[PDB]
Write a protein that binds this ligand. Structure first.
Ligand code: FAD
Ligand code: ANN
Length: 578
Protein backbone atom coordinates (compact mmCIF):
# COMPACT_ATOMS: atom_id res chain seq x y z
CA UNK A 1 0.00 0.00 0.00
CA UNK A 2 0.91 3.59 -0.83
CA UNK A 3 0.12 7.00 0.61
CA UNK A 4 -2.69 8.83 -1.27
CA UNK A 5 -2.53 12.22 0.47
CA UNK A 6 0.10 14.66 1.71
CA UNK A 7 -1.43 14.59 5.21
CA UNK A 8 -0.32 10.94 5.56
CA UNK A 9 3.40 11.59 4.86
CA UNK A 10 5.89 11.25 7.77
CA UNK A 11 7.86 14.36 6.68
CA UNK A 12 7.80 17.34 4.29
CA UNK A 13 11.59 17.24 3.72
CA UNK A 14 13.51 14.44 2.02
CA UNK A 15 17.01 13.95 0.59
CA UNK A 16 15.54 13.30 -2.87
CA UNK A 17 12.16 13.72 -4.48
CA UNK A 18 11.52 11.61 -7.58
CA UNK A 19 8.55 12.56 -9.71
CA UNK A 20 6.99 9.66 -11.65
CA UNK A 21 6.84 6.02 -10.47
CA UNK A 22 7.39 4.83 -14.01
CA UNK A 23 9.90 2.91 -16.11
CA UNK A 24 12.87 5.06 -14.99
CA UNK A 25 11.56 6.64 -11.81
CA UNK A 26 11.11 3.36 -9.98
CA UNK A 27 14.72 2.44 -10.85
CA UNK A 28 15.90 5.73 -9.35
CA UNK A 29 13.78 5.43 -6.17
CA UNK A 30 14.90 1.83 -5.57
CA UNK A 31 18.58 2.39 -6.42
CA UNK A 32 18.91 5.52 -4.28
CA UNK A 33 17.32 3.89 -1.21
CA UNK A 34 19.64 0.82 -1.26
CA UNK A 35 21.81 2.28 1.55
CA UNK A 36 18.78 2.12 3.90
CA UNK A 37 19.59 5.73 4.90
CA UNK A 38 18.96 8.10 1.95
CA UNK A 39 15.38 9.42 2.11
CA UNK A 40 13.30 9.46 -1.03
CA UNK A 41 9.75 10.56 -1.69
CA UNK A 42 8.38 9.15 -4.94
CA UNK A 43 5.34 11.05 -6.24
CA UNK A 44 3.09 9.43 -8.84
CA UNK A 45 0.01 10.88 -10.57
CA UNK A 46 -1.69 7.52 -11.14
CA UNK A 47 -3.19 4.60 -9.23
CA UNK A 48 -1.73 1.50 -7.62
CA UNK A 49 -1.05 -1.44 -9.97
CA UNK A 50 -2.18 -3.86 -7.26
CA UNK A 51 -4.95 -6.29 -8.10
CA UNK A 52 -5.32 -5.14 -11.74
CA UNK A 53 -5.44 -8.20 -14.01
CA UNK A 54 -4.95 -6.16 -17.17
CA UNK A 55 -1.52 -5.10 -15.80
CA UNK A 56 -0.37 -8.46 -14.31
CA UNK A 57 -1.54 -10.68 -17.14
CA UNK A 58 0.48 -10.31 -20.39
CA UNK A 59 -2.39 -11.53 -22.52
CA UNK A 60 -4.80 -8.84 -21.29
CA UNK A 61 -2.58 -5.92 -22.37
CA UNK A 62 -4.88 -4.76 -25.22
CA UNK A 63 -7.73 -4.31 -22.72
CA UNK A 64 -6.08 -1.11 -21.42
CA UNK A 65 -6.36 0.56 -24.84
CA UNK A 66 -7.55 2.97 -25.96
CA UNK A 67 -9.03 4.14 -22.67
CA UNK A 68 -8.77 2.71 -19.18
CA UNK A 69 -8.07 3.73 -15.56
CA UNK A 70 -4.35 2.87 -15.94
CA UNK A 71 -3.80 4.89 -19.09
CA UNK A 72 -3.42 8.56 -19.89
CA UNK A 73 -5.25 9.10 -23.20
CA UNK A 74 -4.98 12.11 -25.44
CA UNK A 75 -4.54 12.93 -29.08
CA UNK A 76 -2.10 14.84 -31.23
CA UNK A 77 -2.89 18.01 -33.03
CA UNK A 78 -3.88 17.20 -36.66
CA UNK A 79 -0.89 15.55 -38.34
CA UNK A 80 -0.23 17.31 -41.65
CA UNK A 81 1.47 14.32 -43.33
CA UNK A 82 -1.30 11.92 -42.15
CA UNK A 83 -4.23 13.57 -43.95
CA UNK A 84 -4.63 15.90 -40.93
CA UNK A 85 -5.63 13.00 -38.71
CA UNK A 86 -5.39 13.62 -34.94
CA UNK A 87 -3.63 10.49 -33.66
CA UNK A 88 -4.32 8.79 -30.29
CA UNK A 89 -1.59 8.98 -27.69
CA UNK A 90 -1.44 6.64 -24.70
CA UNK A 91 1.01 6.39 -21.84
CA UNK A 92 0.89 4.64 -18.49
CA UNK A 93 -0.75 6.37 -15.52
CA UNK A 94 -0.12 3.78 -12.84
CA UNK A 95 2.67 2.53 -10.59
CA UNK A 96 5.22 1.19 -13.07
CA UNK A 97 4.22 3.89 -15.55
CA UNK A 98 4.35 2.79 -19.17
CA UNK A 99 6.22 -0.42 -18.19
CA UNK A 100 2.96 -1.56 -16.51
CA UNK A 101 0.95 -1.18 -19.73
CA UNK A 102 3.46 -1.69 -22.55
CA UNK A 103 3.93 -4.72 -24.76
CA UNK A 104 6.75 -6.09 -22.60
CA UNK A 105 9.41 -6.31 -25.35
CA UNK A 106 12.94 -5.70 -24.07
CA UNK A 107 15.57 -4.65 -26.61
CA UNK A 108 18.63 -2.81 -25.29
CA UNK A 109 19.50 -1.72 -28.86
CA UNK A 110 22.79 -2.08 -30.73
CA UNK A 111 26.18 -1.31 -29.23
CA UNK A 112 26.22 1.67 -31.64
CA UNK A 113 23.14 3.16 -29.92
CA UNK A 114 25.22 3.83 -26.77
CA UNK A 115 28.21 4.90 -28.87
CA UNK A 116 25.92 7.46 -30.52
CA UNK A 117 24.90 8.77 -27.03
CA UNK A 118 28.65 9.23 -26.32
CA UNK A 119 29.21 11.00 -29.66
CA UNK A 120 26.21 13.30 -29.26
CA UNK A 121 27.09 14.24 -25.68
CA UNK A 122 30.89 14.22 -25.93
CA UNK A 123 30.82 11.92 -22.87
CA UNK A 124 32.37 8.44 -23.16
CA UNK A 125 30.53 7.35 -19.97
CA UNK A 126 27.51 6.74 -22.25
CA UNK A 127 29.50 4.58 -24.69
CA UNK A 128 28.73 0.86 -24.92
CA UNK A 129 32.11 0.09 -23.34
CA UNK A 130 30.93 1.84 -20.17
CA UNK A 131 27.19 1.02 -20.45
CA UNK A 132 27.52 -2.78 -20.66
CA UNK A 133 27.86 -2.94 -16.87
CA UNK A 134 24.45 -1.24 -16.50
CA UNK A 135 22.81 -3.64 -18.94
CA UNK A 136 24.11 -6.66 -17.01
CA UNK A 137 22.98 -5.06 -13.75
CA UNK A 138 19.47 -4.38 -15.09
CA UNK A 139 18.15 -7.68 -16.49
CA UNK A 140 18.62 -11.44 -16.62
CA UNK A 141 17.40 -14.32 -18.76
CA UNK A 142 14.91 -16.74 -17.19
CA UNK A 143 13.39 -19.98 -18.61
CA UNK A 144 10.10 -19.93 -20.56
CA UNK A 145 7.04 -20.77 -18.51
CA UNK A 146 6.47 -24.03 -20.42
CA UNK A 147 10.13 -25.17 -20.24
CA UNK A 148 10.38 -25.52 -24.05
CA UNK A 149 13.82 -25.84 -25.61
CA UNK A 150 15.08 -22.35 -26.53
CA UNK A 151 18.35 -23.62 -28.06
CA UNK A 152 19.17 -21.47 -31.08
CA UNK A 153 16.64 -18.70 -30.15
CA UNK A 154 18.64 -16.82 -27.49
CA UNK A 155 22.24 -16.55 -26.31
CA UNK A 156 22.55 -16.86 -22.49
CA UNK A 157 26.11 -15.58 -22.64
CA UNK A 158 24.90 -12.03 -23.52
CA UNK A 159 22.53 -11.66 -20.53
CA UNK A 160 23.26 -10.46 -17.00
CA UNK A 161 22.14 -10.88 -13.42
CA UNK A 162 19.69 -8.03 -12.85
CA UNK A 163 16.11 -7.76 -11.53
CA UNK A 164 14.25 -7.34 -14.81
CA UNK A 165 13.54 -10.93 -16.01
CA UNK A 166 13.42 -11.73 -19.72
CA UNK A 167 11.95 -14.93 -21.15
CA UNK A 168 11.04 -16.38 -24.50
CA UNK A 169 7.34 -17.13 -24.77
CA UNK A 170 5.79 -19.73 -22.48
CA UNK A 171 2.97 -20.80 -24.84
CA UNK A 172 3.43 -21.76 -28.52
CA UNK A 173 2.31 -20.01 -31.68
CA UNK A 174 2.43 -20.97 -35.38
CA UNK A 175 4.75 -18.10 -36.37
CA UNK A 176 8.01 -18.97 -34.60
CA UNK A 177 8.81 -22.13 -36.62
CA UNK A 178 7.93 -20.45 -39.91
CA UNK A 179 10.07 -17.44 -38.98
CA UNK A 180 13.02 -19.72 -38.17
CA UNK A 181 12.62 -21.75 -41.37
CA UNK A 182 12.34 -18.61 -43.56
CA UNK A 183 15.37 -16.83 -42.01
CA UNK A 184 17.83 -19.60 -41.04
CA UNK A 185 17.80 -21.09 -44.55
CA UNK A 186 20.97 -20.63 -46.68
CA UNK A 187 20.38 -17.65 -48.92
CA UNK A 188 17.34 -16.40 -46.91
CA UNK A 189 16.46 -12.88 -48.01
CA UNK A 190 15.83 -11.95 -44.35
CA UNK A 191 18.53 -13.42 -42.00
CA UNK A 192 18.02 -14.87 -38.52
CA UNK A 193 19.21 -13.13 -35.33
CA UNK A 194 20.23 -15.51 -32.50
CA UNK A 195 20.07 -12.75 -29.89
CA UNK A 196 19.08 -9.18 -30.65
CA UNK A 197 20.30 -8.20 -27.18
CA UNK A 198 23.86 -9.29 -28.00
CA UNK A 199 24.93 -6.11 -29.82
CA UNK A 200 23.64 -6.66 -33.36
CA UNK A 201 19.88 -6.50 -33.99
CA UNK A 202 19.87 -7.17 -37.73
CA UNK A 203 17.60 -10.04 -38.77
CA UNK A 204 14.53 -11.75 -37.33
CA UNK A 205 14.76 -12.92 -33.71
CA UNK A 206 12.36 -14.50 -31.21
CA UNK A 207 11.12 -11.75 -28.91
CA UNK A 208 12.33 -11.50 -25.29
CA UNK A 209 9.61 -10.26 -22.89
CA UNK A 210 9.56 -8.95 -19.31
CA UNK A 211 7.57 -11.99 -18.10
CA UNK A 212 8.37 -14.43 -15.31
CA UNK A 213 6.01 -17.12 -13.99
CA UNK A 214 3.62 -15.99 -16.77
CA UNK A 215 3.30 -12.55 -15.11
CA UNK A 216 4.32 -9.08 -16.30
CA UNK A 217 7.36 -7.88 -14.35
CA UNK A 218 7.16 -4.12 -14.80
CA UNK A 219 9.34 -1.62 -13.01
CA UNK A 220 6.96 -1.64 -10.02
CA UNK A 221 7.58 -5.37 -9.61
CA UNK A 222 11.34 -5.43 -10.48
CA UNK A 223 12.33 -2.31 -8.58
CA UNK A 224 9.69 -0.61 -6.44
CA UNK A 225 7.86 -3.41 -4.58
CA UNK A 226 11.11 -4.94 -3.16
CA UNK A 227 12.31 -1.48 -2.10
CA UNK A 228 9.05 -0.60 -0.32
CA UNK A 229 10.01 -2.53 2.84
CA UNK A 230 12.75 0.07 3.35
CA UNK A 231 12.04 2.72 6.02
CA UNK A 232 13.77 5.41 3.96
CA UNK A 233 11.46 5.06 0.89
CA UNK A 234 8.07 6.73 0.84
CA UNK A 235 5.69 6.55 -2.11
CA UNK A 236 2.80 8.96 -2.68
CA UNK A 237 0.36 7.95 -5.43
CA UNK A 238 -2.71 9.67 -6.91
CA UNK A 239 -0.94 13.07 -6.79
CA UNK A 240 0.15 15.17 -9.79
CA UNK A 241 3.16 17.48 -9.56
CA UNK A 242 1.88 20.89 -10.68
CA UNK A 243 5.23 22.70 -10.79
CA UNK A 244 8.59 23.13 -9.09
CA UNK A 245 9.00 26.13 -6.84
CA UNK A 246 12.22 28.11 -6.92
CA UNK A 247 14.36 27.99 -3.79
CA UNK A 248 17.74 29.52 -2.80
CA UNK A 249 20.58 29.99 -5.29
CA UNK A 250 23.16 27.21 -5.13
CA UNK A 251 26.54 27.50 -6.81
CA UNK A 252 25.41 30.70 -8.53
CA UNK A 253 22.42 29.01 -10.23
CA UNK A 254 18.69 29.06 -9.39
CA UNK A 255 17.43 25.90 -7.71
CA UNK A 256 13.95 24.38 -7.61
CA UNK A 257 13.99 22.18 -4.52
CA UNK A 258 10.31 22.58 -3.72
CA UNK A 259 7.77 20.31 -5.39
CA UNK A 260 4.13 21.31 -5.51
CA UNK A 261 1.41 18.71 -6.05
CA UNK A 262 -2.29 17.98 -5.77
CA UNK A 263 -4.68 15.03 -6.21
CA UNK A 264 -6.59 16.93 -8.93
CA UNK A 265 -7.35 20.40 -10.25
CA UNK A 266 -9.81 21.26 -7.47
CA UNK A 267 -7.62 19.93 -4.64
CA UNK A 268 -5.52 22.07 -2.31
CA UNK A 269 -1.84 22.09 -3.35
CA UNK A 270 0.90 20.84 -1.04
CA UNK A 271 4.65 21.35 -1.08
CA UNK A 272 7.53 19.05 -0.14
CA UNK A 273 11.24 19.93 -0.21
CA UNK A 274 14.37 18.05 -1.29
CA UNK A 275 17.69 18.79 0.40
CA UNK A 276 19.88 17.19 -2.32
CA UNK A 277 18.07 16.85 -5.64
CA UNK A 278 14.73 16.75 -7.37
CA UNK A 279 14.68 14.06 -10.06
CA UNK A 280 12.08 14.36 -12.83
CA UNK A 281 11.03 10.94 -14.17
CA UNK A 282 7.61 11.98 -15.42
CA UNK A 283 8.39 10.79 -18.96
CA UNK A 284 8.77 12.48 -22.34
CA UNK A 285 5.41 14.31 -22.02
CA UNK A 286 5.16 14.90 -18.25
CA UNK A 287 8.76 16.10 -17.65
CA UNK A 288 8.73 18.96 -20.23
CA UNK A 289 5.27 19.99 -19.00
CA UNK A 290 6.55 20.27 -15.42
CA UNK A 291 9.67 22.15 -16.59
CA UNK A 292 7.65 24.62 -18.69
CA UNK A 293 5.10 25.29 -15.91
CA UNK A 294 8.08 25.90 -13.58
CA UNK A 295 9.33 28.61 -15.97
CA UNK A 296 12.19 26.49 -17.35
CA UNK A 297 11.93 26.48 -21.14
CA UNK A 298 11.73 28.66 -24.22
CA UNK A 299 11.51 32.21 -22.88
CA UNK A 300 9.55 33.63 -25.85
CA UNK A 301 7.02 30.81 -26.14
CA UNK A 302 6.40 30.50 -22.41
CA UNK A 303 6.01 34.27 -21.92
CA UNK A 304 3.32 34.18 -24.63
CA UNK A 305 1.41 31.50 -22.66
CA UNK A 306 1.71 33.69 -19.55
CA UNK A 307 4.36 31.71 -17.65
CA UNK A 308 6.84 33.73 -15.60
CA UNK A 309 10.08 32.41 -17.07
CA UNK A 310 13.06 31.91 -14.78
CA UNK A 311 15.51 29.88 -16.86
CA UNK A 312 15.72 30.25 -20.61
CA UNK A 313 16.25 26.67 -21.72
CA UNK A 314 14.98 26.56 -25.32
CA UNK A 315 15.30 22.78 -25.84
CA UNK A 316 12.53 21.99 -23.33
CA UNK A 317 9.69 20.25 -25.22
CA UNK A 318 11.55 20.40 -28.52
CA UNK A 319 13.06 17.54 -30.52
CA UNK A 320 10.12 15.22 -29.79
CA UNK A 321 10.82 11.92 -31.59
CA UNK A 322 8.50 8.93 -31.94
CA UNK A 323 8.23 5.75 -34.02
CA UNK A 324 5.49 5.59 -36.74
CA UNK A 325 3.89 2.17 -37.25
CA UNK A 326 1.43 0.77 -39.78
CA UNK A 327 -0.02 -2.74 -39.87
CA UNK A 328 0.21 -5.18 -42.79
CA UNK A 329 -2.64 -7.62 -42.19
CA UNK A 330 -2.78 -11.08 -43.74
CA UNK A 331 -5.53 -13.63 -43.62
CA UNK A 332 -4.05 -16.99 -42.65
CA UNK A 333 -4.96 -20.61 -43.28
CA UNK A 334 -4.79 -21.42 -39.61
CA UNK A 335 -6.96 -21.74 -36.53
CA UNK A 336 -3.99 -21.17 -34.14
CA UNK A 337 -4.13 -17.34 -33.98
CA UNK A 338 -5.21 -15.29 -30.96
CA UNK A 339 -8.05 -13.53 -32.79
CA UNK A 340 -10.82 -15.37 -30.92
CA UNK A 341 -9.33 -14.22 -27.63
CA UNK A 342 -9.49 -10.58 -28.77
CA UNK A 343 -12.99 -10.87 -30.22
CA UNK A 344 -14.73 -13.06 -27.61
CA UNK A 345 -14.73 -12.05 -23.95
CA UNK A 346 -15.84 -15.54 -22.89
CA UNK A 347 -12.81 -17.06 -24.66
CA UNK A 348 -10.51 -14.48 -23.02
CA UNK A 349 -12.09 -15.13 -19.60
CA UNK A 350 -11.61 -18.89 -19.90
CA UNK A 351 -7.91 -18.50 -20.72
CA UNK A 352 -7.71 -15.96 -17.84
CA UNK A 353 -9.10 -18.63 -15.52
CA UNK A 354 -6.38 -21.02 -16.72
CA UNK A 355 -3.76 -18.31 -16.01
CA UNK A 356 -5.14 -17.69 -12.53
CA UNK A 357 -5.08 -21.46 -11.90
CA UNK A 358 -1.51 -22.32 -12.90
CA UNK A 359 -0.03 -19.41 -14.91
CA UNK A 360 -0.15 -21.24 -18.27
CA UNK A 361 -1.71 -20.87 -21.67
CA UNK A 362 -2.24 -18.00 -24.17
CA UNK A 363 -2.45 -15.37 -21.41
CA UNK A 364 1.32 -15.66 -20.85
CA UNK A 365 2.09 -14.37 -24.36
CA UNK A 366 3.04 -10.84 -25.32
CA UNK A 367 1.49 -9.17 -28.42
CA UNK A 368 4.33 -10.16 -30.73
CA UNK A 369 6.24 -13.35 -31.51
CA UNK A 370 9.28 -12.10 -33.36
CA UNK A 371 11.02 -8.86 -34.32
CA UNK A 372 13.05 -8.18 -37.44
CA UNK A 373 15.44 -5.26 -37.87
CA UNK A 374 16.70 -4.19 -41.33
CA UNK A 375 18.72 -1.43 -42.92
CA UNK A 376 18.14 0.30 -46.20
CA UNK A 377 21.08 -0.59 -48.53
CA UNK A 378 24.23 1.51 -47.94
CA UNK A 379 24.30 2.29 -51.67
CA UNK A 380 20.60 3.33 -51.47
CA UNK A 381 19.58 6.57 -53.24
CA UNK A 382 17.86 8.29 -50.27
CA UNK A 383 21.24 8.70 -48.50
CA UNK A 384 22.23 11.27 -51.16
CA UNK A 385 19.73 13.61 -49.48
CA UNK A 386 19.60 12.25 -45.89
CA UNK A 387 22.27 11.49 -43.33
CA UNK A 388 21.86 8.12 -41.63
CA UNK A 389 19.27 8.71 -38.86
CA UNK A 390 20.17 5.34 -37.25
CA UNK A 391 23.09 4.56 -34.86
CA UNK A 392 24.83 2.70 -37.70
CA UNK A 393 26.11 -0.86 -37.61
CA UNK A 394 23.89 -3.44 -35.92
CA UNK A 395 20.84 -1.10 -35.85
CA UNK A 396 17.98 -1.01 -38.35
CA UNK A 397 16.07 1.71 -40.14
CA UNK A 398 13.02 -0.58 -40.25
CA UNK A 399 11.46 -3.05 -37.83
CA UNK A 400 8.97 -5.73 -38.89
CA UNK A 401 6.97 -7.02 -35.92
CA UNK A 402 5.19 -10.37 -36.24
CA UNK A 403 1.95 -10.78 -34.35
CA UNK A 404 -0.14 -13.94 -34.11
CA UNK A 405 -3.44 -12.06 -34.61
CA UNK A 406 -4.98 -8.96 -36.18
CA UNK A 407 -3.39 -6.38 -33.89
CA UNK A 408 -5.90 -3.49 -33.52
CA UNK A 409 -4.44 -0.13 -34.55
CA UNK A 410 -6.48 2.03 -36.90
CA UNK A 411 -8.64 -0.98 -37.72
CA UNK A 412 -9.90 -3.77 -35.49
CA UNK A 413 -10.29 -7.41 -36.58
CA UNK A 414 -13.24 -8.55 -38.68
CA UNK A 415 -15.68 -10.81 -36.82
CA UNK A 416 -14.62 -13.83 -38.87
CA UNK A 417 -11.21 -15.15 -39.97
CA UNK A 418 -7.68 -15.67 -38.67
CA UNK A 419 -4.87 -13.19 -39.16
CA UNK A 420 -1.17 -12.42 -38.98
CA UNK A 421 0.01 -8.86 -38.59
CA UNK A 422 3.40 -7.73 -39.85
CA UNK A 423 3.83 -4.23 -38.42
CA UNK A 424 6.07 -1.86 -40.41
CA UNK A 425 7.93 0.50 -38.05
CA UNK A 426 10.39 3.25 -38.90
CA UNK A 427 12.74 2.79 -35.97
CA UNK A 428 15.22 5.46 -37.16
CA UNK A 429 12.87 8.37 -38.05
CA UNK A 430 14.11 11.74 -39.24
CA UNK A 431 10.87 13.57 -38.30
CA UNK A 432 10.92 15.73 -35.14
CA UNK A 433 8.19 17.65 -33.35
CA UNK A 434 7.21 19.36 -30.08
CA UNK A 435 5.41 19.19 -26.75
CA UNK A 436 3.98 22.61 -25.81
CA UNK A 437 1.66 24.06 -23.18
CA UNK A 438 -1.89 25.00 -24.06
CA UNK A 439 -2.35 26.81 -20.76
CA UNK A 440 -0.77 27.69 -17.39
CA UNK A 441 -3.29 25.31 -15.85
CA UNK A 442 -1.14 22.36 -14.74
CA UNK A 443 -4.08 19.94 -15.25
CA UNK A 444 -4.68 21.04 -18.86
CA UNK A 445 -3.69 18.63 -21.61
CA UNK A 446 -0.39 19.47 -23.38
CA UNK A 447 -0.18 20.14 -27.11
CA UNK A 448 1.43 17.10 -28.76
CA UNK A 449 2.84 17.37 -32.27
CA UNK A 450 5.23 14.51 -33.23
CA UNK A 451 5.10 15.51 -36.92
CA UNK A 452 4.67 11.83 -37.77
CA UNK A 453 5.79 10.90 -41.32
CA UNK A 454 6.59 14.56 -42.06
CA UNK A 455 10.08 13.65 -43.27
CA UNK A 456 10.32 12.21 -46.78
CA UNK A 457 12.88 9.80 -45.26
CA UNK A 458 10.15 8.36 -42.99
CA UNK A 459 7.57 8.21 -45.80
CA UNK A 460 9.98 6.35 -48.09
CA UNK A 461 11.10 3.99 -45.33
CA UNK A 462 7.66 2.99 -44.05
CA UNK A 463 6.51 2.21 -47.60
CA UNK A 464 9.68 0.22 -48.22
CA UNK A 465 8.96 -1.62 -44.96
CA UNK A 466 5.46 -2.59 -46.19
CA UNK A 467 7.06 -4.10 -49.32
CA UNK A 468 9.53 -5.98 -47.15
CA UNK A 469 6.67 -7.38 -45.06
CA UNK A 470 4.99 -8.67 -48.22
CA UNK A 471 8.31 -10.15 -49.47
CA UNK A 472 9.02 -11.77 -46.09
CA UNK A 473 5.81 -13.79 -46.17
CA UNK A 474 6.27 -14.83 -49.83
CA UNK A 475 8.89 -17.52 -49.09
CA UNK A 476 7.92 -21.18 -49.07
CA UNK A 477 7.62 -21.65 -45.23
CA UNK A 478 4.87 -19.01 -45.37
CA UNK A 479 3.25 -20.33 -48.57
CA UNK A 480 0.65 -22.62 -46.99
CA UNK A 481 -0.06 -20.20 -44.10
CA UNK A 482 -0.59 -16.78 -45.65
CA UNK A 483 -3.65 -16.72 -47.89
CA UNK A 484 -4.13 -13.07 -48.82
CA UNK A 485 -3.60 -9.45 -47.78
CA UNK A 486 -6.36 -7.34 -46.30
CA UNK A 487 -6.90 -4.07 -44.38
CA UNK A 488 -5.92 -0.58 -45.49
CA UNK A 489 -2.34 -1.31 -46.55
CA UNK A 490 -2.87 -4.91 -47.60
CA UNK A 491 -5.75 -4.02 -49.95
CA UNK A 492 -3.48 -1.49 -51.70
CA UNK A 493 -1.50 -2.46 -54.80
CA UNK A 494 2.28 -2.07 -54.93
CA UNK A 495 2.43 1.37 -56.57
CA UNK A 496 4.37 3.95 -54.48
CA UNK A 497 1.73 6.75 -54.68
CA UNK A 498 -1.03 4.26 -53.81
CA UNK A 499 0.93 2.94 -50.83
CA UNK A 500 1.77 6.46 -49.63
CA UNK A 501 -1.89 7.47 -49.77
CA UNK A 502 -2.73 4.30 -47.79
CA UNK A 503 0.14 4.98 -45.31
CA UNK A 504 -1.31 8.44 -44.59
CA UNK A 505 -4.49 6.63 -43.39
CA UNK A 506 -3.02 3.52 -41.73
CA UNK A 507 -0.03 5.01 -39.86
CA UNK A 508 -0.19 5.76 -36.12
CA UNK A 509 2.31 6.33 -33.32
CA UNK A 510 3.67 3.33 -31.48
CA UNK A 511 3.76 5.57 -28.36
CA UNK A 512 7.56 5.90 -27.88
CA UNK A 513 7.72 9.71 -27.39
CA UNK A 514 11.34 10.62 -26.62
CA UNK A 515 14.02 13.33 -26.36
CA UNK A 516 11.96 16.32 -25.10
CA UNK A 517 14.51 17.36 -22.44
CA UNK A 518 17.50 15.71 -24.00
CA UNK A 519 21.19 15.50 -23.06
CA UNK A 520 23.61 17.77 -24.89
CA UNK A 521 27.23 18.97 -24.30
CA UNK A 522 27.86 21.76 -21.77
CA UNK A 523 27.44 25.06 -23.65
CA UNK A 524 25.10 23.61 -26.29
CA UNK A 525 21.42 24.63 -26.41
CA UNK A 526 20.68 21.57 -28.59
CA UNK A 527 19.39 19.87 -25.42
CA UNK A 528 17.89 20.80 -22.06
CA UNK A 529 20.23 18.87 -19.78
CA UNK A 530 23.95 18.22 -19.51
CA UNK A 531 25.59 14.78 -20.06
CA UNK A 532 25.26 14.15 -16.32
CA UNK A 533 21.43 14.58 -16.70
CA UNK A 534 21.37 17.83 -14.72
CA UNK A 535 19.14 20.55 -16.15
CA UNK A 536 21.02 23.40 -17.83
CA UNK A 537 20.89 26.69 -15.96
CA UNK A 538 19.68 25.06 -12.71
CA UNK A 539 21.24 23.57 -9.59
CA UNK A 540 19.78 20.44 -7.92
CA UNK A 541 17.45 19.24 -10.72
CA UNK A 542 18.04 16.10 -12.76
CA UNK A 543 15.97 14.47 -15.51
CA UNK A 544 16.00 10.67 -15.68
CA UNK A 545 13.44 9.25 -18.14
CA UNK A 546 12.69 9.08 -21.85
CA UNK A 547 12.99 12.89 -22.10
CA UNK A 548 16.75 12.65 -21.49
CA UNK A 549 17.75 10.42 -24.40
CA UNK A 550 19.61 12.45 -27.11
CA UNK A 551 18.32 10.25 -29.95
CA UNK A 552 15.33 7.90 -30.11
CA UNK A 553 16.44 4.24 -29.78
CA UNK A 554 16.32 2.27 -33.04
CA UNK A 555 14.03 -0.18 -31.24
CA UNK A 556 11.59 -0.60 -28.36
CA UNK A 557 12.90 1.98 -25.82
CA UNK A 558 12.04 0.56 -22.38
CA UNK A 559 15.44 -1.13 -22.08
CA UNK A 560 17.49 1.94 -23.06
CA UNK A 561 15.44 3.96 -20.55
CA UNK A 562 16.14 1.36 -17.88
CA UNK A 563 19.90 1.59 -18.63
CA UNK A 564 19.86 5.38 -18.60
CA UNK A 565 18.15 5.22 -15.19
CA UNK A 566 20.68 2.65 -13.94
CA UNK A 567 23.60 4.91 -14.80
CA UNK A 568 21.80 8.07 -13.66
CA UNK A 569 21.27 6.43 -10.29
CA UNK A 570 25.01 5.80 -10.01
CA UNK A 571 25.80 9.38 -11.09
CA UNK A 572 23.66 10.64 -8.18
CA UNK A 573 25.35 8.21 -5.78
CA UNK A 574 28.79 9.36 -6.98
CA UNK A 575 28.06 13.07 -6.74
CA UNK A 576 26.60 12.90 -3.25
CA UNK A 577 29.01 10.17 -2.03
CA UNK A 578 26.17 7.94 -0.90
C1 FAD B 1 0.86 0.80 -24.92
C2 FAD B 1 2.36 0.92 -25.00
C3 FAD B 1 3.12 -0.14 -25.45
C4 FAD B 1 4.53 -0.09 -25.43
N1 FAD B 1 5.24 -1.22 -25.76
C5 FAD B 1 6.56 -1.19 -25.54
C6 FAD B 1 7.31 -2.39 -25.72
O1 FAD B 1 6.82 -3.49 -25.83
N2 FAD B 1 8.66 -2.26 -25.39
C7 FAD B 1 9.33 -1.07 -25.13
O2 FAD B 1 10.56 -1.08 -25.05
N3 FAD B 1 8.62 0.08 -25.05
C8 FAD B 1 7.31 0.01 -25.21
N4 FAD B 1 6.57 1.15 -24.99
C9 FAD B 1 7.32 2.36 -24.60
C10 FAD B 1 7.90 2.40 -23.19
O3 FAD B 1 6.94 1.70 -22.39
C11 FAD B 1 8.14 3.85 -22.82
O4 FAD B 1 8.98 4.51 -23.78
C12 FAD B 1 8.82 3.92 -21.43
O5 FAD B 1 8.24 2.97 -20.51
C13 FAD B 1 8.72 5.31 -20.81
O6 FAD B 1 9.53 5.34 -19.63
P1 FAD B 1 9.56 6.68 -18.75
O7 FAD B 1 10.11 6.31 -17.43
O8 FAD B 1 10.18 7.76 -19.57
O9 FAD B 1 8.03 7.04 -18.62
P2 FAD B 1 6.77 6.34 -17.93
O10 FAD B 1 7.07 4.92 -17.62
O11 FAD B 1 5.57 6.66 -18.72
O12 FAD B 1 6.74 6.98 -16.47
C14 FAD B 1 6.23 8.29 -16.24
C15 FAD B 1 5.50 8.27 -14.93
O13 FAD B 1 5.33 9.63 -14.40
C16 FAD B 1 3.98 9.81 -14.05
N5 FAD B 1 3.69 11.23 -14.20
C17 FAD B 1 3.62 11.97 -15.36
N6 FAD B 1 3.38 13.25 -15.17
C18 FAD B 1 3.33 13.36 -13.78
C19 FAD B 1 3.12 14.47 -12.93
N7 FAD B 1 2.95 15.71 -13.36
N8 FAD B 1 3.12 14.23 -11.59
C20 FAD B 1 3.30 12.98 -11.16
N9 FAD B 1 3.51 11.86 -11.87
C21 FAD B 1 3.51 12.13 -13.18
C22 FAD B 1 3.21 8.90 -15.00
O14 FAD B 1 1.92 8.66 -14.50
C23 FAD B 1 4.10 7.66 -15.04
O15 FAD B 1 3.98 6.72 -13.97
C24 FAD B 1 5.18 1.09 -24.99
C25 FAD B 1 4.38 2.17 -24.60
C26 FAD B 1 3.02 2.06 -24.50
C27 FAD B 1 2.22 3.22 -23.96
C1 ANN C 1 2.22 -5.52 -31.79
O1 ANN C 1 3.55 -5.73 -31.23
C2 ANN C 1 4.15 -4.64 -30.71
C3 ANN C 1 5.19 -4.86 -29.80
C4 ANN C 1 5.85 -3.78 -29.21
C5 ANN C 1 5.43 -2.47 -29.55
C6 ANN C 1 6.03 -1.35 -28.96
O2 ANN C 1 7.23 -1.36 -28.59
O3 ANN C 1 5.32 -0.34 -28.72
C7 ANN C 1 4.41 -2.29 -30.47
C8 ANN C 1 3.75 -3.35 -31.09
Amino acid sequence: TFFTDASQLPATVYDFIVVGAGNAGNVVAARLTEDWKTTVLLIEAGISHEGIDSVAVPGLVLDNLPFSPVMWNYTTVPQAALDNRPIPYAKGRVVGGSSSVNFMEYTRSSNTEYDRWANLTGDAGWSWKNMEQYYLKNSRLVPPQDGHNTTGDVDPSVHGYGPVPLSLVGTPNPLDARMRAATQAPGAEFPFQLDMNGGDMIGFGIVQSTILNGERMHSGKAFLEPAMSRPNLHVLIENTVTRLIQTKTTNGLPSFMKVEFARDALSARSVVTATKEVVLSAGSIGTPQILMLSGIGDREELTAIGVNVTVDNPAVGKHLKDHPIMANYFQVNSNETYDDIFRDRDVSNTFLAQWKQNRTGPMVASPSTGLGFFRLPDNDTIFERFADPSPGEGAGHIELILSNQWTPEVQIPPATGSFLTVHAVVVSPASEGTVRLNSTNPFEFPLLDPQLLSSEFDQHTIIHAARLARQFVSSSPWADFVESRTGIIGDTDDDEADLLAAARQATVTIWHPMCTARMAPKGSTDGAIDPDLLVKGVSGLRVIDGAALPAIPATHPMAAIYLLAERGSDLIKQKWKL
